[PDB]
Structure 1
Amino acid sequence: EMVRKCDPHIGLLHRGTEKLIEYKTYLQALPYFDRLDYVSMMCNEQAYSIAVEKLLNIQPPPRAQWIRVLFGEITRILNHIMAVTTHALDIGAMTPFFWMFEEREKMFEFYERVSGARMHAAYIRPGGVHQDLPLGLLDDIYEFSKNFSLRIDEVEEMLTNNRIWRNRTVDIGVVTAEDALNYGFSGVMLRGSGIQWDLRKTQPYDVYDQVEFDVPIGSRGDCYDRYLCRVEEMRQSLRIIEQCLNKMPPGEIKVDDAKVSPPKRAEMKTSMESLIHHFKLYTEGYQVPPGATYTAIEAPKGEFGVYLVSDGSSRPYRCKIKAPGFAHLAGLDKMSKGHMLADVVAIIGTQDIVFGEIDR
């Protein structure tokens, strides 16, 4: 029951998104990104939105950025909730998975209320945000936030100081700091080792520079320290929501640039130029200037980056997706050395892997 060699044979979920994008316009390709990392849904399309914004040389309005940060943190809580729980489900603690999914269901109402889909909200377009928040949805988010830190404690009681959980997780998957960078790790895997790195605090891309929060860093590299990094990030993300709720400036939700973002429904039906732009933005799509960019955002898994190449046309030329799980799973061989089969099971989760982003 000791593993001498792991050969992860990814490819069982290779839909081939990168090629299908090249035949689709920029707006048409947006839902592809909600389906890559399918547990942090609207924090993927933020990476796409930032990349297209960079090439187009536009920036979203102040209100849109806060929505993208406010909802970029609900994705973090959504994704860390699964990571803490589905990691524990394989280990054996089934109960926490059922408790925290009574909170995922609550938060999926927010997507279903800002967008119309529970999961794949095509809500964060490059030109800001698609549609404004319905009245009172901030109140519901706040009522969720107060009760939440109690929920995280209830899970924290169950599987944080148990002998069974510490023994199943401590001293396992120790990754040296030197190897973490050489293996291209990012996100919690870097921070578990001890390396201080977070794109929200070093390469800010939104109002994240005006919001205060702390980045948890672990002493040892084991799966236990990076468990605490996931649980402690939920606490800090729940701290950003307090700030975003308390400063959500009034204004527009999409850039007032009818050549990139569509105009309102009302103006479409009374003014000519608005109808033309509505007609062309949804048939050919806005044209982005030729160029190449690599924009990275701190997705909950880690460094999710998209490399858009472009030509003077409405459909991109090459869209490579830096899924954070590609490097982590490639390093799975080194993690599980002198560790039993059950430990490998406990190391798949601690990387917080979904194969939509890996295979893509």
Structure 2
Amino acid sequence: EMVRKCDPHIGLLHRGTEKLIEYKTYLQALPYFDRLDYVSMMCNEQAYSLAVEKLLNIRPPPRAQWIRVLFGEITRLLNHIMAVTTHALDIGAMTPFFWMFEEREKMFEFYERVSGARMHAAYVRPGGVHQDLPLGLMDDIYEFSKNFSLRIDELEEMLTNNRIWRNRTVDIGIVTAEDALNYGFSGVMLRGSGIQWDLRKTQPYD
């Protein structure tokens, strides 16, 4: 069971998204970005929107910029719940997935209430957002956010100091700060190795 070589064969989900975009207007191409990292839908929309707004030389209004950050961080919660719980599910710990996907389901409601879609909102667009927040939505996001840290605590009670969890993750897949940079890593894959880098801090947007 020693791994002597990993040879990842990909393209089993290659759908020529980049060639297809050449046949779309800039609006028509926006929904293709929901379906890239299809766990971080609105973050992908934002990256594409900022690129088009830059070539257009226009600026989105301040309220749209605040909505984009608000839903970017809600999306980051969506992604990290999927990242952590499915990671734990693969390692054998199946129960955090269920507790936390109920939270994910409540955040899908926020997506659906601003856009009409639980996942592929197509909500963030070059110029701002498609529609304004429906009345009463910020109250409900506050109720969700009020209780969420306790949910993270339960997740940490299950994993963080669990010796079985630590045996499966401690000193596993060590990557050095130098290799991570040269291999093109980013995000947590850099910061886990001590590199102090975050585009929200160093190259902020919105």
TM range (shorter): over 0.9
Deviation at 1:88, TM superposition (A): 0.4
Alpha-carbon deviations, 1:44-65, whole Å to 9, x = none? 0100000000000000001000
**Residue 137 of structure 2 corresponds to which residue in structure 1?**
137
Shift of 1:167: 0.1
- Give 1:32's aligned residue: 32
Listed as ranges, the gaps of 5+ residues in structure 1 are 205-360
Task: Report the identity percentage.
Answer: 97
Instruction: Kindly state the Cα deviation for residue 108 of structure 1 after the two structures are TM-superposed.
Output: 0.4
Shift of 1:142: 0.2
Question: Which has the larger helix fraction?
Answer: 2
Task: Give the drift of 1:35.
Answer: 0.2
SS at match of 1:43: helix
Aligned-pair CA distance for 1:197? 0.4
* Correspondence 1:310-329 to 2 at 5 A: none
Q: Report the equivalent of 1:55.
A: 55
Other structure's SS at 1:200 match: helix
Structure number with greater CO (CA < 8 Å, separation at least 6) is: 1
Partner of residue 161, structure 2: 161
Gapped regions of structure 2 (runs ≥ 5): none
Q: Tell me the TM-score normalized by structure 1.
A: 0.57
Q: Per-residue deviation at 1:187?
A: 0.2
- TM-score, normalisation: structure 2: 0.99
- In 1, the alpha carbon distance for the partners of 2:68 and 2:179 equals 33
For residue 5 of structure 1, report the CA deviation from its aligned partner. 0.4
Quote the offset at 1:91 in angstroms: 0.3
The CA deviation at 1:101 is 0.3
Per the TM alignment, residue 69 of structure 1 is displaced from its structure 2 partner at its CA by: 0.2
Deviation, structure 1 residue 118 = 0.5
Report the alpha carbon displacement of residue 42 of structure 1 after superposing the two structures with TM. Answer: 0.4
3-state DSSP class of the match of 1:59?
Answer: coil
Match of 2:186 in 1: 186
Specify the SS of the correspondent of 2:26: coil
Q: What whole-Å deviation, never above 9, does each CA across 1:296-328 have from its counterpart, x for those lacking one?
A: xxxxxxxxxxxxxxxxxxxxxxxxxxxxxxxxx
Q: Could you tell me how far apart the structure 2 residues matched to 1:180 and 1:69 are?
A: 28
For each residue in 1:254-297, what CA deviation from the matched residue of structure 2 results, as whole angstroms up to 9, or x when unmatched?
xxxxxxxxxxxxxxxxxxxxxxxxxxxxxxxxxxxxxxxxxxxx
In structure 2, C-alpha distance between the alignment counterparts of 1:184 and 1:107, rounded to whole Å: 32
* Whole-Å separation in 1 of the counterparts to 2:111 and 2:138: 12
Report Cα offsets for 1:115-169 as digits up to 9, x if no partner: 0111000100101110000001000000000100000000010011011000000
Matched residues in 1 for 2:86 and 2:134: separation? 32
Deviation at 1:9, TM superposition (A): 0.2
Runs of 4+ in 1 over 4 A off after TM superposition: none
Rounded Cα–Cα distance in structure 2 between residues aligned with 1:42 and 1:200: 16
Q: Deviations over 1:5-58 (max 9, x none)?
A: 000001100011000000000000000000000000100010000000000000
Q: How far does residue 188 in structure 1 lie from its aligned partner after superposition?
A: 0.2
User: Separation in 1 of the partners of 2:16 and 2:91?
Assistant: 32
CA distance in 1, matches of 2:118, 2:77: 15
User: CA–CA distance in 1 between the matches of 2:83 and 2:160?
Assistant: 14
**Number of matched residues?**
204
SS class of match (1:172): coil
